[PDB]
Design a protein around this ligand. Structure first.
Ligand SMILES: Cn1c(=O)ccc2ccccc21
Length: 119
Protein backbone atom coordinates (compact mmCIF):
# COMPACT_ATOMS: atom_id res chain seq x y z
CA UNK A 1 0.00 0.00 0.00
CA UNK A 2 3.03 2.42 -0.55
CA UNK A 3 1.57 5.30 -2.77
CA UNK A 4 5.14 6.51 -3.68
CA UNK A 5 6.78 3.11 -4.61
CA UNK A 6 5.96 3.44 -8.36
CA UNK A 7 8.69 6.10 -8.88
CA UNK A 8 11.72 3.87 -8.02
CA UNK A 9 10.02 0.94 -9.84
CA UNK A 10 9.81 3.11 -13.00
CA UNK A 11 13.46 4.30 -12.59
CA UNK A 12 14.59 0.61 -12.45
CA UNK A 13 12.48 -0.35 -15.53
CA UNK A 14 13.92 2.61 -17.51
CA UNK A 15 17.47 1.46 -16.55
CA UNK A 16 16.65 -2.06 -17.96
CA UNK A 17 15.28 -0.44 -21.17
CA UNK A 18 18.50 1.69 -21.62
CA UNK A 19 20.66 -1.53 -21.28
CA UNK A 20 18.56 -3.29 -24.11
CA UNK A 21 20.14 -2.92 -27.65
CA UNK A 22 16.53 -2.56 -29.02
CA UNK A 23 16.22 0.87 -27.27
CA UNK A 24 19.18 2.59 -29.06
CA UNK A 25 17.00 4.32 -31.84
CA UNK A 26 14.66 5.67 -29.09
CA UNK A 27 17.16 6.98 -26.40
CA UNK A 28 17.31 10.55 -27.88
CA UNK A 29 14.97 12.58 -30.16
CA UNK A 30 14.67 11.34 -33.78
CA UNK A 31 17.34 13.14 -35.93
CA UNK A 32 15.73 15.47 -38.51
CA UNK A 33 18.93 15.56 -40.71
CA UNK A 34 18.61 11.69 -41.00
CA UNK A 35 14.70 11.82 -41.54
CA UNK A 36 13.82 15.32 -42.96
CA UNK A 37 10.01 14.58 -43.35
CA UNK A 38 9.64 13.40 -39.64
CA UNK A 39 7.68 16.46 -38.27
CA UNK A 40 5.32 16.36 -41.36
CA UNK A 41 4.04 12.95 -40.02
CA UNK A 42 4.67 13.17 -36.19
CA UNK A 43 3.07 16.08 -34.22
CA UNK A 44 4.46 15.20 -30.74
CA UNK A 45 8.02 13.74 -30.53
CA UNK A 46 8.94 11.56 -27.52
CA UNK A 47 12.05 9.55 -26.43
CA UNK A 48 13.29 7.64 -23.34
CA UNK A 49 15.75 10.39 -22.22
CA UNK A 50 12.81 12.87 -22.09
CA UNK A 51 10.72 10.34 -20.06
CA UNK A 52 13.61 9.71 -17.57
CA UNK A 53 14.30 13.50 -17.16
CA UNK A 54 10.56 14.23 -16.58
CA UNK A 55 10.50 11.48 -13.87
CA UNK A 56 13.74 12.71 -12.19
CA UNK A 57 12.51 16.38 -12.21
CA UNK A 58 9.39 15.34 -10.19
CA UNK A 59 7.08 16.19 -13.16
CA UNK A 60 5.03 12.94 -13.22
CA UNK A 61 2.23 12.68 -10.61
CA UNK A 62 1.43 8.96 -11.37
CA UNK A 63 2.74 5.95 -13.30
CA UNK A 64 -0.26 6.33 -15.69
CA UNK A 65 1.26 9.62 -16.97
CA UNK A 66 4.69 7.96 -17.54
CA UNK A 67 2.97 5.02 -19.34
CA UNK A 68 1.14 7.48 -21.72
CA UNK A 69 4.49 9.08 -22.77
CA UNK A 70 6.21 5.65 -23.26
CA UNK A 71 3.23 4.46 -25.39
CA UNK A 72 3.67 7.68 -27.52
CA UNK A 73 7.28 6.55 -28.36
CA UNK A 74 5.80 3.32 -29.79
CA UNK A 75 2.81 4.91 -31.61
CA UNK A 76 5.16 7.48 -33.25
CA UNK A 77 7.36 4.57 -34.55
CA UNK A 78 4.25 2.81 -35.98
CA UNK A 79 3.04 6.06 -37.69
CA UNK A 80 6.47 6.90 -39.21
CA UNK A 81 7.47 3.40 -40.46
CA UNK A 82 7.18 2.83 -44.26
CA UNK A 83 6.72 -0.95 -43.70
CA UNK A 84 5.53 -3.22 -40.88
CA UNK A 85 8.75 -5.24 -41.64
CA UNK A 86 11.19 -2.25 -41.15
CA UNK A 87 14.25 -2.86 -38.84
CA UNK A 88 13.60 0.11 -36.45
CA UNK A 89 9.79 -0.64 -36.22
CA UNK A 90 10.63 -4.32 -35.46
CA UNK A 91 12.87 -3.11 -32.51
CA UNK A 92 9.98 -0.91 -31.20
CA UNK A 93 7.55 -3.90 -31.12
CA UNK A 94 9.92 -6.07 -29.02
CA UNK A 95 10.61 -3.14 -26.63
CA UNK A 96 6.81 -2.48 -26.31
CA UNK A 97 6.16 -6.16 -25.34
CA UNK A 98 8.94 -5.98 -22.64
CA UNK A 99 7.59 -2.65 -21.30
CA UNK A 100 3.94 -3.83 -21.10
CA UNK A 101 4.99 -7.10 -19.34
CA UNK A 102 6.80 -5.09 -16.57
CA UNK A 103 4.54 -1.97 -16.20
CA UNK A 104 1.33 -3.99 -15.42
CA UNK A 105 2.29 -4.76 -11.76
CA UNK A 106 3.52 -1.12 -11.23
CA UNK A 107 0.08 0.24 -12.38
CA UNK A 108 -1.92 -2.38 -10.39
CA UNK A 109 0.04 -1.79 -7.14
CA UNK A 110 -0.28 2.05 -7.42
CA UNK A 111 -4.05 1.92 -8.09
CA UNK A 112 -4.57 -0.59 -5.18
CA UNK A 113 -2.52 1.66 -2.83
CA UNK A 114 -4.65 4.73 -3.71
CA UNK A 115 -7.91 2.76 -3.18
CA UNK A 116 -6.59 1.68 0.30
CA UNK A 117 -5.70 5.34 1.11
CA UNK A 118 -9.30 6.44 0.19
CA UNK A 119 -11.14 3.41 1.89
C1 LIG B 1 13.37 6.73 -37.64
N1 LIG B 1 12.36 5.65 -37.53
C2 LIG B 1 11.55 5.65 -36.39
O1 LIG B 1 11.76 6.50 -35.51
C3 LIG B 1 10.56 4.64 -36.20
C4 LIG B 1 10.34 3.75 -37.19
C5 LIG B 1 11.20 3.69 -38.34
C6 LIG B 1 11.06 2.65 -39.28
C7 LIG B 1 11.88 2.63 -40.43
C8 LIG B 1 12.87 3.60 -40.65
C9 LIG B 1 13.04 4.60 -39.70
C10 LIG B 1 12.22 4.67 -38.54
Amino acid sequence: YDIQAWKKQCEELLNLIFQCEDSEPFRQPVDLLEYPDYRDIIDTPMDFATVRETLEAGNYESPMELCKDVRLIFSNSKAYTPSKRSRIYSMSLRLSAFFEEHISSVLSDYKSALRFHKR
